[PDB]
Amino acid sequence: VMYNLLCDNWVNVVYLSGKPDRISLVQTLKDAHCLQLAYSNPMDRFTVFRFLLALGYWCFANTNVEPEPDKPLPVSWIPWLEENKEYFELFGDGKRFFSRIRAITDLIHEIPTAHNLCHFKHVTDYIDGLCEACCIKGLLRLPVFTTVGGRGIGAGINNTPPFYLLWHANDLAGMLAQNWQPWDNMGIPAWLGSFQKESREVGLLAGMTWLPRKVYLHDPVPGQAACCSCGLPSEALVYSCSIEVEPVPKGLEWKDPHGVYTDQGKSLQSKIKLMSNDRYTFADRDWYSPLFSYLHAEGNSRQGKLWLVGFASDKAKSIDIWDKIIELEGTDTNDELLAQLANRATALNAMRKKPLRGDFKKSVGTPQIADIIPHAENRIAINAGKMTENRGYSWQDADTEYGELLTKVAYSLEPAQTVDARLKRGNFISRKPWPIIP
Amino acid sequence: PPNTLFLRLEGALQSWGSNEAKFALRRTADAPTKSGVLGLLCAAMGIGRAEAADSWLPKLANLRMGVRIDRPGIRWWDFHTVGAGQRTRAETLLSRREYLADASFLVALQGEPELVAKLSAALAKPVWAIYLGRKSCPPSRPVCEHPPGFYNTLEEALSAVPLQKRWHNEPLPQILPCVMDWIPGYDGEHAPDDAEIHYDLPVSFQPPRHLPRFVIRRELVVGEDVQVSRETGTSVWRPKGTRADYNNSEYKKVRAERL
Amino acid sequence: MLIEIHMIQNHSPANLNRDDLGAPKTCYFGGVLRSRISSQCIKRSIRTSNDFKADIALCGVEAALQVAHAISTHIARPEIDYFVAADDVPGEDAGAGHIGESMFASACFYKYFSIDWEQLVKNLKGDTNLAAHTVGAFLLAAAKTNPSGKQNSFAAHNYPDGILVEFKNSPISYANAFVRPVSVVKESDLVEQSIGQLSNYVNDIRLGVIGFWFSPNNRYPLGYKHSKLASRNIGNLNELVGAVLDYIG
Amino acid sequence: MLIEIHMIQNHSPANLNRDDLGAPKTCYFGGVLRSRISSQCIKRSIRTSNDFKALLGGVRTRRLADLIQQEAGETECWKKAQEILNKCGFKNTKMLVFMSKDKIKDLARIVLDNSLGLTEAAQQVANVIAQATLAPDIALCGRMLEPNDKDKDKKVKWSNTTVEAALQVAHAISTHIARPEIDYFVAADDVPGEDAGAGHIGESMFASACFYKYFSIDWEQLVKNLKGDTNLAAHTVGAFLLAAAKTNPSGKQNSFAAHNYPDGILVEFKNSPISYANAFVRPVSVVKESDLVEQSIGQLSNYVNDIRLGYYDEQSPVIGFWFSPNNRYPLGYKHSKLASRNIGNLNELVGAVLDYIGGFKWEEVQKS
Ligand SMILES: [Mg+2]
């Protein structure tokens, strides 16, 4: 069948007038000022906006017009995007958008795949259908959210999917305009043919559209008749995908505009585990972690609404996904306080690991402290950017909300009306997470 | 004329799921979602599965609503270990669930009295084992409480219902947060720049496909329209026994009988 | 028509449900921390053993059960332990084991069940009187085998004391009786005080069906009046089973 | 088929069990403080009892190489043994390992000394450890074994070490409010001095309580882990009955010689066990007449009444027993005349319970 990105509807978006449709590319950049990205998966929204931003950088490299504020996208991009109809095609003889055969369910990471189990979460590979729109917006998560496949299967342009810090706005034109910071290098984006390796530091549009995995896909003698896994009832759907591995060559000095990088060069991953081990305590979404490398290295303090995406993954297991729209105006920064804020997980685990009495090092401590940490984190984190900018919200007054749940936990823990039990309850109350300078 | 029924959501545990749950971390939101009370609605009619997608979700999808927080319950996490192939092999699957504990709510459902009249005889008598949005979370209060009536505005309906109290010396939230939908006062109105998007709008049911919606924060202090209710109902047993009766009129006469 | 097995269950000191770090699980209700066993744990304990199998239409049309988390009638009291595994071969010093710490809690619980009319008839399996037979098994099979847990070191299989079965069709848990956690006064038991709280809640809500009440040798009456708040202060094993059997059909 | 053994023991002022700080163990049963004796202490004291010596055949040691080196007059094999053990899976001198004593002694000695290999030597040592199930104390208390996966070899495997415990000892719950008592002791300096003071002023806590002790035998499990034989099973059941009625926890008995004996035995045969903890949810407060033992037995018999009528199991009745010595302490003082076989001995109840177990006698079985 014939498919095209510029013609057929692919992105689910709400309207500022209040009606969510499915529209194609031409309507969403020709209107571009009455809509917002509306995806159930948050990093999926991030991938689609990344695709739009790379498209905007391509249009800026061709026609050379910047996006002015409070005004929709310039009309000089449709006579650059209208003449190429062989470009964004999926099926047929020609260049495609972005032996070994795996299930198509592993492309969309939320849907379980052929694990080492006889059963999955009520899914089964090569059986459940999936529509064109979700396949296509799952291919946008290849260059930016590709994980390790057992240390023999390579990752994307980063060894692990890094934390992504990014500016959010009420408008799609506002989203594109607020994230327009370019660099002098051009690159070679994947919607061209075979990219030229040339020298290192390949550029920006090359790394925005990097291909860690080849995708070919295959279509049998027609297909299905209704949806079985997506939810939107569509026509005859696809069956399976094809995948291979490109080993990313060594070197390739490349810094991500939205990525958060450790000082040693490795990518910074989200730090959420469902196990409270000897060194971790499950708290919440870790918006606190990726603040050192984005408020000191790239972008820094700036005006505009800030958005944070965390997709934790250990080796080849996808464990969660979330989002956080945080507040930011750009009123400078304190290095040390934001350094403490850059890892509260160590402080929270150190507070959890304290036992009722004693000095053993790997005793589990108080396990009901770990059961009140998530609500306290949710209560602290609603004005997370207010805590970030250090106006009137600090570490020393953020733990004041911890007191009530801790009083009632201490009521459970010391159920005696004695002087001694009241004293241990009060000493239990004084517990709060102490900051750490790493 | 009664255009609104005030759903009463209250139990030891409850959860209406948020959007950030595909993997083993399953989470909730600090409000009963639209499809967290419409699922209760569909169970209250006694149907489910794929029947709710047609003529039951679009039958009220054109209808605005508002929710009220009587007390903000705290978020609790329960350990949950699925045994997989154990009561495949003995590899134990792992998970963690989010539970909203000791939270009472009040949802509105406004616009017309025929559907509310059909709905009033749906909360108490017709059931399909209704719960608080989670299958293992029981509603501790009669859901058919707060009888219907005419109150034309969203705030008037949401604030014109008495507010309960469990014991006498109990702390009470002086500000009641209100979650309201978007009202298009004129065609072409754009949403205010504080209205967060919530993704609770189903267009099908199984498997879940969703639409987003606009949610406007609103506030309510007690006193102007909402007020405390009569409590009574002594929750203190202390087994009863009378004492110290010399004579009312029936000890003088009853002493002589056995004399 | 709906079956509400409101059940009290005291427990001798033993840990039954364990979290990541081994503590008894806890819930939040009434502005206090109370002990908890997970509904999945007790629901699997209702399965996975043959004494109850004497039922796959009821814990799988999906399944037919609403089992609540075991809300304690009082505040949680988690205790801790200290074990030493001996060396038993004479070395240069004494003591050898893991020298770890365990932890346990003794609590009196409550739960609520729900089996509707069509939720039991369309359960069916193969009969129409099965919609009474399986329920009749259930009303005392729910109080047949305490789950599992660290029973080989903390042996606790205390049978329940006071059992309610209601035929009210409106699904309401009586957990609001335990809004105030149960305190102890010297002249009454903890289970007796909890049952008085349940009785005091029972005399309410009827202002705005019956009460089928179980007390073994009627040691626990639902109200110390001739105006009994259940009017069925009886109960002996399968007498209640057969009475529910001919209450349903 | 499983056997319940219940006791009600009153004890002299004693400290049979302590926590890290030295306090007697306490549990919050029924909303009040109850004195507790740990189940593991009772299991250990019954293991080390003076009548289990014909059946004491389990060892819980980390010094396995020391056990090998003891039974070798001149052939020093203690570094070779140590490295064999260190690549067995234990990583150090090791962790705690449960096995039979004589079996590991002789046949680990013969399988270790031969200079035939070093890798397969560790593999066969591990197999000898894993097959060591010919001991009924392991069959009663239970044993798993988890070696490391780091300090090992990829060619060394471990068989399934599944052994289920055939005994569920409950913690001894006091039948009343716990009154923890504080003992103040000094340590006399034998030589005199200027100060005329104590060598060590110390802290000890003791508790005098009437403990509800509760055990339970899974006889079916006791023979599903002790292979097809039943002679050893009956001998172990009789040995436990004698030991539990005869031995006490070896706590501070040198300072509190509380060797008092169980003033109550309740053996009831059924397929659904019960603790009489709910017999004393109401704390036992004594009256001017009778004593704490009689009031506790009275509340226990009241509970036995409404769980033998209200919770009656007449499909499998109670074979409820006693140890009422010449009927000193009767159970049914007002109504509970359901004690079918009230006796006044201990060997008689041992023989009776092995008789309902099967065709056995007390003296013939006592030879395995
Ligand atoms: Mg789709």
PDB file of C-alpha atoms in Angstrom, chain C residues 10-13 77 79-83 85-89 91-93 96-97 101 104 106 144 151-155 157-161 163 184 186-191 214 216-217 219 236-237, chain D residues 4 19-20 25-31 36 39-40 43-44 58-63 67 96 101 165 167-171 173 214 216 272-275 277-278 281-282 303 305-306 309-312:
ATOM      1  CA  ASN C  10      -7.796 -11.918  65.622  1.00  0.00           C
ATOM      2  CA  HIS C  11      -4.239 -13.158  65.163  1.00  0.00           C
ATOM      3  CA  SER C  12      -1.676 -14.506  67.597  1.00  0.00           C
ATOM      4  CA  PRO C  13       1.736 -12.778  67.178  1.00  0.00           C
ATOM      5  CA  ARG C  77       2.040  -2.527  66.283  1.00  0.00           C
ATOM      6  CA  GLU C  79       7.615  -5.571  66.639  1.00  0.00           C
ATOM      7  CA  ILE C  80      11.132  -6.776  65.839  1.00  0.00           C
ATOM      8  CA  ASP C  81      13.046  -9.997  66.509  1.00  0.00           C
ATOM      9  CA  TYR C  82      16.662 -11.070  67.003  1.00  0.00           C
ATOM     10  CA  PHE C  83      17.828 -14.580  66.100  1.00  0.00           C
ATOM     11  CA  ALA C  85      22.075 -19.418  64.602  1.00  0.00           C
ATOM     12  CA  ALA C  86      24.453 -21.425  66.761  1.00  0.00           C
ATOM     13  CA  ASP C  87      27.746 -22.972  65.673  1.00  0.00           C
ATOM     14  CA  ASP C  88      27.200 -26.402  67.356  1.00  0.00           C
ATOM     15  CA  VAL C  89      30.847 -27.344  66.597  1.00  0.00           C
ATOM     16  CA  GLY C  91      35.518 -23.361  67.721  1.00  0.00           C
ATOM     17  CA  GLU C  92      37.893 -20.867  69.280  1.00  0.00           C
ATOM     18  CA  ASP C  93      34.917 -18.537  69.845  1.00  0.00           C
ATOM     19  CA  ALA C  96      28.223 -18.285  64.043  1.00  0.00           C
ATOM     20  CA  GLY C  97      24.933 -17.464  62.344  1.00  0.00           C
ATOM     21  CA  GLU C 101      16.520  -9.447  62.677  1.00  0.00           C
ATOM     22  CA  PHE C 104       6.104  -9.469  63.275  1.00  0.00           C
ATOM     23  CA  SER C 106      -0.408  -9.202  66.038  1.00  0.00           C
ATOM     24  CA  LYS C 144     -11.155 -22.021  56.985  1.00  0.00           C
ATOM     25  CA  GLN C 151       4.312 -20.376  60.182  1.00  0.00           C
ATOM     26  CA  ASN C 152       7.210 -22.823  60.625  1.00  0.00           C
ATOM     27  CA  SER C 153       8.791 -20.321  63.046  1.00  0.00           C
ATOM     28  CA  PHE C 154       5.714 -18.205  63.978  1.00  0.00           C
ATOM     29  CA  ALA C 155       2.911 -20.758  64.259  1.00  0.00           C
ATOM     30  CA  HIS C 157      -3.646 -20.351  62.781  1.00  0.00           C
ATOM     31  CA  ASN C 158      -6.115 -18.627  65.099  1.00  0.00           C
ATOM     32  CA  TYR C 159      -9.653 -19.224  63.865  1.00  0.00           C
ATOM     33  CA  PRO C 160     -11.955 -16.173  63.616  1.00  0.00           C
ATOM     34  CA  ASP C 161     -14.401 -15.262  66.387  1.00  0.00           C
ATOM     35  CA  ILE C 163     -18.521 -13.431  61.459  1.00  0.00           C
ATOM     36  CA  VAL C 184      -8.833  -1.414  75.173  1.00  0.00           C
ATOM     37  CA  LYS C 186     -10.136  -3.678  81.121  1.00  0.00           C
ATOM     38  CA  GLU C 187     -13.648  -5.151  81.395  1.00  0.00           C
ATOM     39  CA  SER C 188     -13.975  -6.161  77.717  1.00  0.00           C
ATOM     40  CA  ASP C 189     -11.821  -8.015  75.212  1.00  0.00           C
ATOM     41  CA  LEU C 190     -10.184  -6.418  72.197  1.00  0.00           C
ATOM     42  CA  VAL C 191     -12.334  -8.635  69.969  1.00  0.00           C
ATOM     43  CA  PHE C 214     -22.460 -15.970  63.482  1.00  0.00           C
ATOM     44  CA  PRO C 216     -19.940 -19.840  68.073  1.00  0.00           C
ATOM     45  CA  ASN C 217     -22.004 -20.802  71.146  1.00  0.00           C
ATOM     46  CA  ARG C 219     -20.479 -15.797  73.291  1.00  0.00           C
ATOM     47  CA  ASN C 236     -23.158 -23.635  64.126  1.00  0.00           C
ATOM     48  CA  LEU C 237     -20.917 -24.704  61.209  1.00  0.00           C
TER      49      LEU C 237
ATOM     50  CA  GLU D   4      -1.030 -30.858  67.838  1.00  0.00           C
ATOM     51  CA  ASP D  19      16.977  -9.755  72.833  1.00  0.00           C
ATOM     52  CA  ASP D  20      20.131  -7.758  72.022  1.00  0.00           C
ATOM     53  CA  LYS D  25      10.842 -11.100  74.622  1.00  0.00           C
ATOM     54  CA  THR D  26       7.462  -9.370  74.445  1.00  0.00           C
ATOM     55  CA  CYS D  27       4.614  -9.390  71.937  1.00  0.00           C
ATOM     56  CA  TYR D  28       1.510  -7.206  71.661  1.00  0.00           C
ATOM     57  CA  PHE D  29      -1.165  -9.899  71.551  1.00  0.00           C
ATOM     58  CA  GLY D  30      -4.729  -8.719  72.039  1.00  0.00           C
ATOM     59  CA  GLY D  31      -3.746  -5.106  72.663  1.00  0.00           C
ATOM     60  CA  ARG D  36       7.245 -14.314  74.781  1.00  0.00           C
ATOM     61  CA  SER D  39      10.262 -20.672  69.004  1.00  0.00           C
ATOM     62  CA  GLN D  40      13.858 -21.229  67.894  1.00  0.00           C
ATOM     63  CA  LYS D  43      13.471 -25.985  69.122  1.00  0.00           C
ATOM     64  CA  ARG D  44      17.153 -25.769  70.055  1.00  0.00           C
ATOM     65  CA  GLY D  58      22.353 -32.968  62.497  1.00  0.00           C
ATOM     66  CA  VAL D  59      25.218 -30.480  62.478  1.00  0.00           C
ATOM     67  CA  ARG D  60      25.040 -26.752  61.627  1.00  0.00           C
ATOM     68  CA  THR D  61      28.656 -25.760  61.103  1.00  0.00           C
ATOM     69  CA  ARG D  62      30.835 -23.424  59.092  1.00  0.00           C
ATOM     70  CA  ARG D  63      33.983 -25.284  60.225  1.00  0.00           C
ATOM     71  CA  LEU D  67      35.549 -31.603  61.087  1.00  0.00           C
ATOM     72  CA  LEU D  96      26.322 -22.043  58.073  1.00  0.00           C
ATOM     73  CA  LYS D 101      27.100 -35.618  61.354  1.00  0.00           C
ATOM     74  CA  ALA D 165      10.114 -28.309  58.181  1.00  0.00           C
ATOM     75  CA  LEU D 167       7.383 -28.845  62.954  1.00  0.00           C
ATOM     76  CA  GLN D 168       5.748 -25.466  63.640  1.00  0.00           C
ATOM     77  CA  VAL D 169       6.716 -24.395  67.155  1.00  0.00           C
ATOM     78  CA  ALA D 170       4.784 -21.327  68.243  1.00  0.00           C
ATOM     79  CA  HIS D 171       6.199 -18.643  70.487  1.00  0.00           C
ATOM     80  CA  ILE D 173       2.615 -16.412  74.758  1.00  0.00           C
ATOM     81  CA  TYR D 214       2.318 -24.604  71.432  1.00  0.00           C
ATOM     82  CA  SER D 216       2.591 -29.010  66.019  1.00  0.00           C
ATOM     83  CA  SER D 272      -6.948 -28.250  60.751  1.00  0.00           C
ATOM     84  CA  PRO D 273      -4.752 -27.139  63.664  1.00  0.00           C
ATOM     85  CA  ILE D 274      -5.642 -24.553  66.333  1.00  0.00           C
ATOM     86  CA  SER D 275      -3.739 -22.506  68.901  1.00  0.00           C
ATOM     87  CA  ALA D 277      -4.320 -17.993  71.949  1.00  0.00           C
ATOM     88  CA  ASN D 278      -7.897 -16.696  71.683  1.00  0.00           C
ATOM     89  CA  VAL D 281      -7.375 -12.720  74.468  1.00  0.00           C
ATOM     90  CA  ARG D 282      -9.059 -11.693  77.681  1.00  0.00           C
ATOM     91  CA  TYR D 303     -12.590 -21.954  74.575  1.00  0.00           C
ATOM     92  CA  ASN D 305     -16.099 -25.838  74.707  1.00  0.00           C
ATOM     93  CA  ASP D 306     -17.183 -23.261  72.153  1.00  0.00           C
ATOM     94  CA  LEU D 309     -19.603 -27.069  69.850  1.00  0.00           C
ATOM     95  CA  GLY D 310     -19.607 -23.704  68.068  1.00  0.00           C
ATOM     96  CA  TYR D 311     -16.652 -24.741  65.891  1.00  0.00           C
ATOM     97  CA  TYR D 312     -17.407 -28.458  66.181  1.00  0.00           C
TER      98      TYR D 312
END
